[PDB]
Amino acid sequence: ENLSPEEAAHQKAVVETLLQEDPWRVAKMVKSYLQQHNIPQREVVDTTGLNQSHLSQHLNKGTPMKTQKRAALYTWYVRKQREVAQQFTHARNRFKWGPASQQILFQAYERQKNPSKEERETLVEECNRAECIQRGVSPSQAQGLGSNLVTEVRVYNWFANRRKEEA
Amino acid sequence: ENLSPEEAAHQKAVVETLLQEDPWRVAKMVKSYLQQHNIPQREVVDTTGLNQSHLSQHLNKGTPMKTQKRAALYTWYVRKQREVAQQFTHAGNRFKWGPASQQILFQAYERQKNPSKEERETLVEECNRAECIQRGVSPSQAQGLGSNLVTEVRVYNWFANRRKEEAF
DNA sequence: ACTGGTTACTCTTTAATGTAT
DNA sequence: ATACATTAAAGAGTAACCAGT
Ligand SMILES: [Cl-]
Ligand SMILES: [Cl-]
């Protein structure tokens, strides 16, 4: 179930049509995927071997890149799309706070700046379920959120740093 | 050149007096000084051996720093001020554009996006004059600017990069 | 001199960490 | 638990470089 002969040709067909498209339209399409799943650009740079500064300038600004290096970018894009779907159905990077959970954390901080462990774990289920809805997946699949899984320790680390922000 | 033994004792009292003052006030004095001379934060990290994220957060945001680390940075503040004096009295890193030179270059780009070489040297002398006035030194002394000295090559590279930014 | 593709370097930001009340 | 004190890690931004009409 890991791979199929036809879908492997479909992956090669997708990267073929993606190279034929406007590289900016694909850049916006890829940047929106990295933001929805909070996958760090370091994973892209470490896997494909591209330049961090070059890849960042291409996604956020549209800096033109040659088709040979762009092909390795689209190759990782199509493969990462399958790995994400499988890892969520079957259920190294640094944690990243999603924008959907940040709104819930700012609500709780405006209410009270020192929640109890029960209130922390309650916000964990709220933020995890929120991160799943953002990624378009079901809540029980939150175990597939991976490195971006909201934990009680991480919620406590967020509230502790936000108290330090008032100075 | 060598600091008089009496002069060195003054530096120590300056560090202790700066340690007695509020750390956020001394942080703003050092940060504004770095912005006036375009001194890279990497150079302060290399000398004082401090953490770049710690020093950046203690200067820009004013994060709590220990008295020992603040004293090591305050020791660099006083030695660099004097070293800048001899750096410029002798006149008789990487380049970093200044705010006044960036505003003048914004004027020329609005008038001519492709200036001639004659227009480049005239802008070089104007920017070097404005950068000298920023730190309160005479326009004649520019060797002390060193890495932050304006050059026609840097002006042409500034307009070429602005052309790439204008394309998007 | 020139656009165009590319990048070493810089510095802010972030989530995480260690510890003595 | 938790405010000081701290930071390894990510990433956008800057000024610059190399090639080839
Ligand atoms: Cl994910
Ligand atoms: Cl200087």
Chain A hits for B61, Cβ within 8 Å: 167
Query: What gap in Å lies between CA B133 and CA B25, rounded to an integer?
Result: 24
Whether the CB-CB separation of B73 and B23 falls below 8 Å is answered with no
Query: What gap in Å lies between CA B39 and CA B144, rounded to an integer?
Result: 12
Count of Cβ atoms closer than 10 Å to residue A132 Cβ: 19
Distances (CA, A) of A76 to A30, A33, A124: 11, 12, 31
Maximal CA-CA distance, chain B: 59
| CATH architecture for residues A5-89 | Orthogonal Bundle (1.10)
The top-level CATH class assigned to B99-167 is mainly alpha
Query: What gap in Å lies between CA A95 and CA A98, rounded to an integer?
Result: 9
Over its C-alpha atoms, chain A yields an Rg (Å, rounded) of: 19
Whether the CB-CB separation of B128 and B150 falls below 8 Å is answered with yes
Approach to solving: X-ray
DSSP string, A83-125: HHHHHHHT--PPP---HHHHHHHHHHHHH-SS--HHHHHHHHH
Nearest residue by alpha-carbon distance to C1' of D16: B157
Query: What gap in Å lies between CA B4 and CA A32, rounded to an integer?
Result: 62
Nearest to A62 among B61, B62, B168 (CB): B168
How close is the Cα of B125 to the center of ligand 2, in Å? 16
Listed residue (B158, B168, B149, B167) closest to B109, CA to CA: B158
Element (H, E) at B106: helix B99-111
Is A60 (CB) below 7 Å from strand D?
yes
Domain A99-165 part of CATH 3.30.420.40: no
Maximal CA-CA distance, chain A: 59
Angle at B46 between CA B44 and CA B49, to 5 degrees: 90
By C-alpha distance, the chain B residue nearest A24 is B168
Query: What gap in Å lies between CA B163 and CA B168, rounded to an integer?
Result: 9
Query: What gap in Å lies between CA B99 and CA B134, rounded to an integer?
Result: 9
Q: Render the burial of B66-87: b for 16+ CB within 10 Å, e for the rest.
A: eeebbbbbbbbbeebeeebeeb
Q: What is the dihedral of CA B103, B108, B111, B113, to 10 degrees?
A: -110
Query: What gap in Å lies between CA B82 and CA B1, rounded to an integer?
Result: 11
Listed residue (A99, A111, A104, A92) closest to A155, CA to CA: A104
Q: What is the resolution of this structure in A?
A: 3.2
Domain ranges of chain A: 5-89, 99-165
Listed residue (A106, A160, A114, A109) closest to A130, CA to CA: A106
Whether the CB-CB separation of B75 and B15 falls below 8 Å is answered with yes
The C-alpha of A35 sits at a distance from chain B's nearest C-alpha, in angstroms, of 22
Q: Render the burial of A14-30: b for 16+ CB within 10 Å, e for the rest.
A: bbeebeeeebeebbeeb
Neighbours of ion ligand 1 (CB under 5 A): A 37, 146
3-state secondary structure labels for all residues of B29-58: HHHHHHHHHCCCHHHHHHHHCCCHHHHHHH
Closest nt to residue A97, judged CA to C1': C15
Pull the structure tokens for residue B134: 């920023």
Chain B hits for A61, Cβ within 8 Å: 168
Query: What gap in Å lies between CA A145 and CA A135, rounded to an integer?
Result: 9
